[PDB]
Structure formats: structure tokens, C-alpha cells
């Protein structure tokens, strides 16, 4: 005999985020690859393209790492990669996610600065400044995801069908999981969301009260960006905070543990829909792709 | 493998760097196509603005304004007007003391295929002495179809409306202004219009507008 | 380490049915507690042994279970 | 007009250090890539250093690498060759040689006056005739070969012919084996095929007396020189 | 006066009216002959091999 | 008195029309019908040149067929090494309003001009090393539409004051002014023998000049709108024009009339540049709808299309050896086609 008797276990409807993962992969990888292609050294003669090149690079990296997520969430969290992959791959996933978020925030700040300071800009506005801001965003994302590099490791004893990739928060009392979760929340959904909202509100207030810069396209694109960001990032952040704070003796943590995959897929939906907005609001993006 | 004459490639790269630096330096300047009728105040407006084809350049609030008086070419306009495409604005100025030549020129330059999406800074120059003309020669003389009050304000408003009526594209703006030859403020008006155009272009480049 | 406490407890067992369903009574079923796995008396000799073995397992794990965290978080 | 003047010559004890200055006036010094060659009191030319336009690339000879360094100051229009650990093999006259590199250009066109600095896988070119007597009004041929073929894959053969009149700086005669330098009389003509090269003078004049040096510019070298005596 | 320009124009017309004109058949034949003669040395009409193509 | 000779002028016009009608015993279309078609010529962009920043308006090849000239709104006149995509020179212009440029047949001098009414001639082979301006030819009262070098010491410029002139570069004077165009001259091309040239103005007429006598030899008036480009046939006994009605016409000098018209119903945009090939069988025309067309000059069929420019092509010219054709566009890009 193997054991007493096996069970195949439920795989709830929240695990059915496979559909979202595959949809995001197929709609993002080719679109983001071509967006990187057009927004590249071919178009890296203007400052306005560096931001979208960096954002599309982060999006493409996240989408290319998505197949690991798709093959793991279906595999019931059993991990079939080496421990060195368990230490580097999820940290790269988190790095690309937070790089995307912070690059979106910096793009919003850049448009706000262009609107409020058109004469201060065009004096100090070059490829160097855009590259410096993108590097700052990437460095901030790396600083955020360091606690994934230092603590994530796999373990498997008295399990044979499974080995699982997890996180080591041992040491002193000094709650580390809660501190890391609060840091991630503050630097990924409060400060970036606040910068987005403030910059876009000020941008609209300045542009609409002029009758020359006034346009409904600006309203549509900024509203779409902020609404997509909030809708597709709120469940992920709130579930992360809940799993960080709720005790392991789950009063209601079972539902959130089931919905983790759904929330992460919803988070990836925004990554998928960033290029959609970029190409639907472009200056002739399809023509540029045909020409380039 | 390149020979020892890869110094030619080095020189080419140095030339490219100098060209890029010159281009980014020139992009920081604002180009204005100054236009209008003969003796309409173009010379007066440039002289009050602190300074063949003649280019007038001045700096106002950290912007380098370049004004091109294209009135020196007594040839076919259509054969060289495509040169002045991609200018920030057209500082069109008229003489209120005059007139239908100005209206015809404004109609020609407002609906031109190159200048469809280019803002126009309209100056009703020399409005100080237009009161003297309107006090003795009513606007009915210049505009036979004009009927209504012959007051200074109403006549000026009617002339401004006639000039703005030659505009068809709703995506361009005509910032009308009056100069009266006192000036000391036309630079501010040009600066504000150029600021609007710059912000609109920045929004266009980012996909917002 | 606590890794070897399972054998220290299992030394009291003396029958192949308990032996099988203790060396496989202990497990990593993240989705269950003891009562969930034992929804039947999987004969009489396993309910006895597996109860103790799974209690040992779940007590030893919970101090630092090192559970899986789904990638992306 | 174009004029390069050098300063920094003198008597130095061996092992010391000294800097040679090349004050260049009369041309766009920034865009030119100035060289630096030397000539021993009783020998031929020997390339020393090279600094390009904008100081973006610098080269040295094997016998001088490390000890020396070349520096250019475009705003002051001067060329510096800081020499350190001087040895008795550095007793020579140092020439500051112009060169501008682009398609159709003529490198080594202008040469400096020179400063007498005295102290108390390489392509080698050989000129067989050490000296050949000549008479005015006749036609004479000077030929030098090279160990490696100088004809690059782009169809250009990189051979330069220089003439050094007695007590004068060398002057470019032929660049790339066929093109006459600007101002050289049309009497001189160049020829060659890959490795063997020849320079022919028709109706030699009494002013052409001097030593002829052929240099390869295929990669980072002169010849012994054929002195013509009337 | 306004008659000098008209006199110049009529003089120009008289001068250029006396140019001997050959039939368009001869001109077309000459054009065909030149094109046929130089067809063999046209790197655009007849594609040159990549060995002799300097832009490949 | 004016009408008394205006009637004579009209009679002379009718007489030349009748003479040209009598001389047209056939047409090129029914003579070259037995010639096999040139087929479909596909050209690929071998080299692209990405140095300019705004609106290349003109271009001229070198006699050595390796060095280009490029004049753009950026105020730079950069000449390229077309083989290796290298910039061997970068000439900053005093006035960025440039409408034309030329490379001397000897290669020593490069000219330029535009809305500044001045043909400034730049010396390349200077002893100082840089590219100075040798002479600034002034005297025109209209924009310089085109300018070509007869040799190192003679240049002919087509200006916007309805006149062309022949200059002496050493002295800087108008050696022989040409007049007779009612509208402003927009184009100019020199015959291979250099003894005569043609010019096309906005009066929809192209006239045949001669640099020695200074008079006007023949007038060709088959167009309907402003002429923007002219080029001789390689043998120098015909030329092809290009106007705003999207038709290129081939006039022949001997018969003094128009042989063929290269018009298609799918094009309604004027031509900006026209040039033949080395043999003269092709006819490369640069149209306003962002792309170039090649025409079978003996059959009028569209041999092919040269697309790849994102904006209007403003200049076009094949090399002397006929190896390649360069097209410059308002997209600030040059392309070399083979």
C-alpha cells in the first residue's frame, strides 16, 4: 500500500486563475514584445519613449515569468525547480511587478511636471534624466524585493509528491513578515497610488482650465489608467496584508488563502492592459509598428 | 575589419555627437512665423519686442523666441510656405487704421493644408489711432455690409469677429489681441500663447491629447 | 532536531499496519487537520497510530511550518 | 597660414623627464589628429605617438609605450608629449605631424620644424637602395617593398611617400600610393601592387635632392630611405 | 513702356519659330537606339551581381 | 500699337503649333510597342542615412558616385560617405532655410541656397582643414530653387524672381542673367555637354537656354501646373519634367514637342523630383504620397514603386555610374536603393 487512502483535493474556483494567467500571457507577450521593439533604440531619440520602453520591458519580463506561475498554480503549489531557482525566480517576479508600478508612478509624475513646468522642462529634459528616473524606479523595486532574495527557500520532509518554495522569517520576535508587508503596501499601493492621483488631478485641473489644452482624451486616458490600477491592484494588496496579519489559526484566512491565486492573476491583468492603453492612446502606434 | 582609417569612423561619430548637441540646443528655441500685410506694424512690433527673409530673436522668461518676417519674399507663397511648417505659432498682425487684403491673407493662411493644426496669434495692431479713423470714417466705409453701432468697441469687436470667421478647423485657436503701439505687453501675450501650444504639444507627445 | 522525533515516537509501534500508516500517517497535507484526514477509520490499527503520529506532526510543524507562499507574493 | 612650431628640446641627463610642446596655429587644430615622429641624428624617421581628434584614441610605438604620453589642449592649440625615463636611444629630433582622416583626405600633409632632444606582428618596410646618384633632367625610380601586403579589403593601398630635403622637415608627396599631395609637382608618380611599391620621378629637378621615406599606414612604420645625390 | 515687353516677346517667338524640327519618328528611334545600346551597362534595369554591387 | 504686334505674336504661336503638329507623324507609344517590357524592378534600401533632424529638402551626388550632399531645415549641410554611411563633413549654414544644394563635378566645392536669396559656395579642400565659405553669390530677388555647377568656376542658379543666372565664382558677379520665364523658376538641369540647360517655372513651361549665347532657344509648354523638377535624358536630347498635376512628361529637343506623359489614375499628388537612369530606360520620379515611382520611359508603364519613406520625398538622384539611386524625404531620412 501507499498510505491509508489518497484524496485529489478540491481546486476551488479561485484556483481557476489559470484562465486569467493564460489570457494575460497570450495578450501580453506578443504585444509587449512589439511595444518594446517599436519603443527601443529605433525610437530612443526622444525622452517620451524611455518611460514606455522601461515599462514595457518590466511588463515583458513579468509576462515571460508568468508560465512558471501557470505551471505551479495548476501543480498545487508543488515546486519542481532547484532551490537556487526558488531563491531567484520569485524575487525577479516581485522585482518586475514593483518596477512596473513605480515606473507607472514616475510616468505620471513626468506628465504632471510637463504640464506644470513647460519652461523649466525643455531646459533640463533629456535622455539622461529619463534614464536616471527609470533607474531610480528599478533600484526602489530591488530594495523592495531584497527581503525575497534573503529569505525564500524550499523544504520537503515527510512529503514525497511535494516540495514547496517558502519564506524563512525566523530569528527574534521582531515581526518581520508584518514589517515587510507594511513596507510593500506603503511603497507599492499607497505612495504610488497617491502620486498617481495627485499628479493626474493637478494635470487635469491645469489642462482643462485653459480651453487650448482642454481635451476629453486626457480625461479618458488618465481615468482608465488610475481605475485599472486601483481595481486590479487592490485585491492583491489587501489579501497580502490579511495573510500577513491574520493568525495561522485561520478564523477567515482559508478563503483568502484560496483567493491568493485569483488576486495575483487580477494583479497581472493590469500588467496586460498597460500596453492596451499605450497603443489605444498613441500618436499612430500602428503606423510606427508597420514602419519600424 | 576596418583599416587604420577607422579614424574616419571616429570622426563620423564626433560629427554625429555635434549634430545631436546642436539639434537639442535648437529644439529649446521657439519658432514664430510673423506674418501680415505691408506696413501693418510688423516692424513696429519687432522693434517694440526688445529688438530677403529676416529673423528677429529675443528671449523672454527663459524662452528663446525666433520671429521670421517672411514678408520679404515677393514671389509665390505656396512654393515656400511649406518651409515654415512645424512652427509653434503664427503671429499674424493687421493694421486697424486701414484692409480686405489682410482678410484675404488671413483666409489663405488659416485654411492652408500645412497650417491646419497651427495656432495663430492675431494682433489688431495700431488700435490707438483707429479711434481717430472711426470717429470720422465709419466702419461702414471699409465694410459696406456692416450694420450696427459705430462705437469704437463694437467696431473693433466686429473686425475681430470678421477675422476669426475665416477659421474653419475647430482644433486651432486664434488669440486675438490689440496693441495700440504702446506694446510692452505683446511679449507677454506671445509667451502665453506659446506656453499653451507647448503644453498641448507635450500632452500630444505623451498620448494624453 | 524535531525532524527525528517521529521515529522516537514510532518506536512504540510494533505492527506493519501502524508502521505503514504512521510513516505515511505523517504527511504535508496543507489542506487538512488530523480529523479531516481520518474521515474514516482507514481498520482499527491505523486510527490509533495515525492519530498520535499526525498529532506529533502537526505540533512539530506549527512552531515554524515553512508553508508554501504562492509566487508573486 | 598653417604653421606648427615645436618647443622642448635641450640637453637632458639619462633617466630624467621632459615635455615637448607643439604650438599649432593657422588651422582647425581640434579636428586634426596630430602625430609625433622622431628622427635620430644619423638615421631615418620613427613613429612615436599619436593622439586623435578629441583625444578619443591614442597609440604608441613598442619602444616608447609606457614611458611617454601624448596630450592635446585644443583651446590653447598645443600638443604635449610628456617623456619620462629618457634613455640614450631617445636622442633624436621630434616632429609634430598633422593628419586628418576622412574619405579622400591626405594624412601627414604638414610637418613641424622639429626639436633636437638629446640625452648624454609589425609590418616592416625595406628600401633596397641606400643611395642612388642622379643628374638633373633625368628620370629616376625609387622602390620599396613591405613584408605584409598593404592593400586593404576596400581597395585602398596604404602607402605614403615622404621627401626630406637637406635640413628641412619631411613633406608628403604621395598618399595611398597614387594620389599626389596638394602642391607637389606632377613629376612624381606612384605605382605598386600589394607588397612591391615604386615611385617614379620624371624630369628630376635639382630641388628634389633629398632622402625619400615610404611609410605604411595599414596598422600601427617607415623605411630606411633612399638618398638622392645630384 | 508697355510695348517694349511685347516687342521682346514677339522677337523671341520669331527667333524660336525658326528652329528646324525633325519628325518625332526619328527622335523616338534615336531614343530607342540609345536605350538599347546602354541597356547592357545599366545597373538598375539589369540587376548587377552582388560581387560588383558596392552597396550590398 | 501693342495689339498690332500682339496679333503677330498670336499668329507666330499658331504657326509654331502647326509646325509641331506637322512634325508629329507618329508617337512614342506606337513606335516602342514592339519593344519588350522592362518588367517589374524591385529596389531594396541598401543604406539608410539617419543624421539629419528635420526635412531634407535637397540632395546631390558626387562625380565619384560615393559622396552625397544633404541639405535640411536643421541648418546643416552634411556630405556622406554613401558606401560606409559615414559623415565626412558637417557644414553649419548661416540660414537654415535651404531649398537646394549641389556638388561640384571636381568635388572641391559644394553650393547651397534657399530663402536667403544667396548662393553660398563652400570650399571643402581647404588647407585650414575646416569647410569655409568661399563666395556668397548675391543679386537674386527670390528664393534659390536650384543651383548646379558647370565647373569649379561657373555656377547657374534658378531663383524665384522668374529668372536664372550664370555666375562667375571668382568675381561673384552675374555673368549672364537669363530671363523669359513669367513665373518663378523652380527647377534646373544641365545637359551632359554642359553647353545648354533647361529650367521649369510655375508658369507650367520648361524653356531651353544656352549658357554661351544667353538667349532662349526653345519653349516646351505641355504641362498644366507648376513644374517642380527637370532632368535631361542621358544622351542630352530629351528631358522629363514633373508638375503638381501628378504627370511627368518627356519632351524631345529635336522635335521641340512632348513625346510621352507618365500619368496614372491612382496618383493625384505632384512630383517633387525626377531623374533618369544611366541607360535612360527608367524614369525615377519622387511623388508627394510618401513614395517614389519608376517609369518605363519608353512605354510609360509603372515598372515598380520605391516605398519606405514616412513623408514626402523632396529630392532624388541616381549616381553617375548608375549603381544606385538616393531618395531624401521630409522625414529627415535618406535611403540608397539598388
Short mmCIF file of C-alpha atoms in Angstrom, two decimals, chain A residues 47-244:
data_model
loop_
_atom_site.label_atom_id
_atom_site.label_comp_id
_atom_site.label_asym_id
_atom_site.label_seq_id
_atom_site.Cartn_x
_atom_site.Cartn_y
_atom_site.Cartn_z
CA UNK A 47 12.62 61.50 -23.91
CA UNK A 48 8.98 60.38 -24.15
CA UNK A 49 9.96 56.87 -25.28
CA UNK A 50 12.33 55.88 -22.45
CA UNK A 51 9.49 55.67 -19.92
CA UNK A 52 7.38 53.38 -22.10
CA UNK A 53 10.41 51.30 -23.07
CA UNK A 54 11.19 50.66 -19.40
CA UNK A 55 7.55 49.97 -18.56
CA UNK A 56 7.18 47.54 -21.47
CA UNK A 57 10.45 45.81 -20.51
CA UNK A 58 9.13 45.26 -16.98
CA UNK A 59 5.80 44.06 -18.39
CA UNK A 60 7.52 41.68 -20.82
CA UNK A 61 9.70 40.22 -18.06
CA UNK A 62 6.66 39.67 -15.84
CA UNK A 63 4.76 38.01 -18.69
CA UNK A 64 7.74 35.80 -19.59
CA UNK A 65 7.99 34.69 -15.96
CA UNK A 66 4.23 34.06 -15.91
CA UNK A 67 4.50 30.48 -17.35
CA UNK A 68 6.18 29.39 -14.11
CA UNK A 69 3.14 30.72 -12.25
CA UNK A 70 0.79 28.96 -14.67
CA UNK A 71 2.57 25.62 -14.25
CA UNK A 72 2.87 25.99 -10.46
CA UNK A 73 -0.67 27.08 -9.53
CA UNK A 74 -2.01 24.13 -11.52
CA UNK A 75 0.58 21.87 -9.87
CA UNK A 76 -0.97 22.55 -6.43
CA UNK A 77 2.00 24.58 -5.14
CA UNK A 78 4.34 21.63 -5.54
CA UNK A 79 7.64 23.11 -6.69
CA UNK A 80 9.73 21.33 -9.30
CA UNK A 81 12.73 23.64 -9.66
CA UNK A 82 16.06 23.76 -7.84
CA UNK A 83 16.33 25.77 -4.63
CA UNK A 84 18.53 28.32 -6.40
CA UNK A 85 15.60 28.93 -8.75
CA UNK A 86 13.29 29.15 -5.72
CA UNK A 87 15.53 31.94 -4.39
CA UNK A 88 15.92 33.97 -7.61
CA UNK A 89 12.80 33.46 -9.77
CA UNK A 90 10.04 34.68 -7.39
CA UNK A 91 12.25 37.59 -6.38
CA UNK A 92 12.59 38.52 -10.05
CA UNK A 93 8.80 38.28 -10.41
CA UNK A 94 8.32 40.67 -7.49
CA UNK A 95 11.06 42.94 -8.84
CA UNK A 96 9.33 43.23 -12.20
CA UNK A 97 5.93 43.83 -10.58
CA UNK A 98 7.18 46.66 -8.38
CA UNK A 99 9.29 48.07 -11.22
CA UNK A 100 6.12 48.27 -13.31
CA UNK A 101 4.22 50.00 -10.50
CA UNK A 102 6.96 52.54 -9.76
CA UNK A 103 7.59 53.19 -13.46
CA UNK A 104 3.89 53.99 -13.87
CA UNK A 105 4.16 56.37 -10.91
CA UNK A 106 7.22 58.08 -12.41
CA UNK A 107 5.49 58.39 -15.80
CA UNK A 108 2.57 60.10 -14.06
CA UNK A 109 4.96 62.44 -12.26
CA UNK A 110 6.66 63.17 -15.58
CA UNK A 111 3.41 64.18 -17.28
CA UNK A 112 2.48 66.33 -14.28
CA UNK A 113 5.87 68.06 -14.47
CA UNK A 114 5.47 68.58 -18.22
CA UNK A 115 2.08 70.22 -17.68
CA UNK A 116 3.01 72.44 -14.73
CA UNK A 117 6.59 73.28 -15.79
CA UNK A 118 6.85 73.50 -19.59
CA UNK A 119 9.54 76.19 -19.47
CA UNK A 120 11.52 74.58 -16.64
CA UNK A 121 11.34 71.44 -18.74
CA UNK A 122 12.72 71.66 -22.29
CA UNK A 123 15.75 73.10 -20.47
CA UNK A 124 16.53 70.12 -18.24
CA UNK A 125 14.79 67.29 -20.10
CA UNK A 126 16.93 64.75 -21.93
CA UNK A 127 17.58 61.05 -22.25
CA UNK A 128 19.84 61.26 -19.20
CA UNK A 129 17.10 62.45 -16.87
CA UNK A 130 14.59 59.86 -18.09
CA UNK A 131 17.14 57.07 -17.75
CA UNK A 132 18.04 58.30 -14.26
CA UNK A 133 14.38 58.29 -13.19
CA UNK A 134 13.86 54.80 -14.62
CA UNK A 135 16.97 53.58 -12.82
CA UNK A 136 15.68 55.11 -9.59
CA UNK A 137 12.40 53.22 -10.02
CA UNK A 138 14.23 49.95 -10.70
CA UNK A 139 16.52 50.46 -7.69
CA UNK A 140 13.49 51.13 -5.49
CA UNK A 141 11.90 47.90 -6.74
CA UNK A 142 15.11 45.99 -5.98
CA UNK A 143 15.20 47.48 -2.48
CA UNK A 144 11.59 46.34 -2.05
CA UNK A 145 12.29 42.79 -3.22
CA UNK A 146 15.53 42.24 -1.26
CA UNK A 147 13.56 40.51 1.57
CA UNK A 148 12.54 37.94 -1.05
CA UNK A 149 16.15 37.27 -2.02
CA UNK A 150 17.30 36.89 1.57
CA UNK A 151 14.55 34.63 2.96
CA UNK A 152 12.89 32.48 0.26
CA UNK A 153 13.91 28.81 0.31
CA UNK A 154 12.37 25.38 -0.28
CA UNK A 155 11.88 22.45 2.11
CA UNK A 156 10.45 18.93 1.91
CA UNK A 157 10.42 16.26 4.61
CA UNK A 158 7.78 13.59 5.12
CA UNK A 159 6.43 14.62 1.77
CA UNK A 160 7.26 12.80 -1.42
CA UNK A 161 4.83 14.12 -4.02
CA UNK A 162 5.70 17.67 -2.89
CA UNK A 163 8.50 20.07 -2.25
CA UNK A 164 7.40 23.63 -1.59
CA UNK A 165 9.10 27.01 -2.04
CA UNK A 166 8.56 29.21 1.00
CA UNK A 167 10.00 32.00 3.14
CA UNK A 168 12.18 31.94 6.28
CA UNK A 169 11.16 34.67 8.75
CA UNK A 170 12.94 33.14 11.75
CA UNK A 171 15.06 34.95 14.33
CA UNK A 172 14.00 37.24 17.15
CA UNK A 173 10.45 38.25 17.98
CA UNK A 174 10.67 41.38 15.80
CA UNK A 175 7.70 40.64 13.46
CA UNK A 176 9.36 40.54 10.04
CA UNK A 177 6.50 39.32 7.85
CA UNK A 178 4.27 42.17 9.03
CA UNK A 179 7.05 44.74 8.60
CA UNK A 180 7.79 43.53 5.06
CA UNK A 181 4.08 43.52 4.20
CA UNK A 182 3.64 47.06 5.50
CA UNK A 183 6.69 48.21 3.54
CA UNK A 184 5.33 46.60 0.38
CA UNK A 185 1.91 48.18 0.93
CA UNK A 186 3.31 51.66 1.57
CA UNK A 187 5.74 51.65 -1.35
CA UNK A 188 3.53 49.78 -3.83
CA UNK A 189 -0.09 50.82 -3.28
CA UNK A 190 -0.16 53.93 -1.07
CA UNK A 191 2.72 56.11 -2.23
CA UNK A 192 2.46 55.14 -5.94
CA UNK A 193 -1.33 55.44 -5.89
CA UNK A 194 -1.10 58.77 -4.07
CA UNK A 195 1.42 60.09 -6.59
CA UNK A 196 -0.77 58.91 -9.48
CA UNK A 197 -3.91 60.52 -8.07
CA UNK A 198 -2.26 63.81 -7.08
CA UNK A 199 -0.31 64.19 -10.32
CA UNK A 200 -3.26 63.36 -12.56
CA UNK A 201 -5.70 65.54 -10.61
CA UNK A 202 -3.33 68.50 -10.84
CA UNK A 203 -2.67 67.74 -14.51
CA UNK A 204 -6.39 67.75 -15.34
CA UNK A 205 -7.05 70.86 -13.26
CA UNK A 206 -4.31 72.73 -15.13
CA UNK A 207 -5.15 71.50 -18.63
CA UNK A 208 -8.95 71.82 -18.53
CA UNK A 209 -8.90 75.43 -17.30
CA UNK A 210 -7.24 76.70 -20.47
CA UNK A 211 -9.61 75.92 -23.44
CA UNK A 212 -6.48 75.27 -25.54
CA UNK A 213 -5.09 72.26 -23.68
CA UNK A 214 -8.60 71.10 -22.73
CA UNK A 215 -9.48 67.70 -24.18
CA UNK A 216 -11.60 64.73 -23.16
CA UNK A 217 -8.92 62.29 -24.37
CA UNK A 218 -6.70 63.25 -21.43
CA UNK A 219 -9.58 62.63 -19.03
CA UNK A 220 -10.31 59.26 -20.62
CA UNK A 221 -6.72 58.02 -20.57
CA UNK A 222 -5.86 59.14 -17.04
CA UNK A 223 -9.16 57.83 -15.67
CA UNK A 224 -8.57 54.50 -17.40
CA UNK A 225 -5.02 54.27 -16.03
CA UNK A 226 -5.96 55.07 -12.43
CA UNK A 227 -9.14 52.96 -12.43
CA UNK A 228 -7.39 49.92 -13.91
CA UNK A 229 -4.51 50.32 -11.45
CA UNK A 230 -6.79 50.53 -8.41
CA UNK A 231 -9.23 47.80 -9.43
CA UNK A 232 -6.54 45.32 -10.43
CA UNK A 233 -4.14 46.00 -7.54
CA UNK A 234 -6.47 46.42 -4.55
CA UNK A 235 -7.42 42.74 -4.00
CA UNK A 236 -3.78 41.64 -4.24
CA UNK A 237 -2.57 44.17 -1.66
CA UNK A 238 -5.48 43.64 0.72
CA UNK A 239 -5.07 39.86 0.62
CA UNK A 240 -1.33 40.22 1.19
CA UNK A 241 -1.99 42.36 4.26
CA UNK A 242 -4.66 39.96 5.54
CA UNK A 243 -2.42 36.90 5.20
CA UNK A 244 0.39 38.85 6.86
#
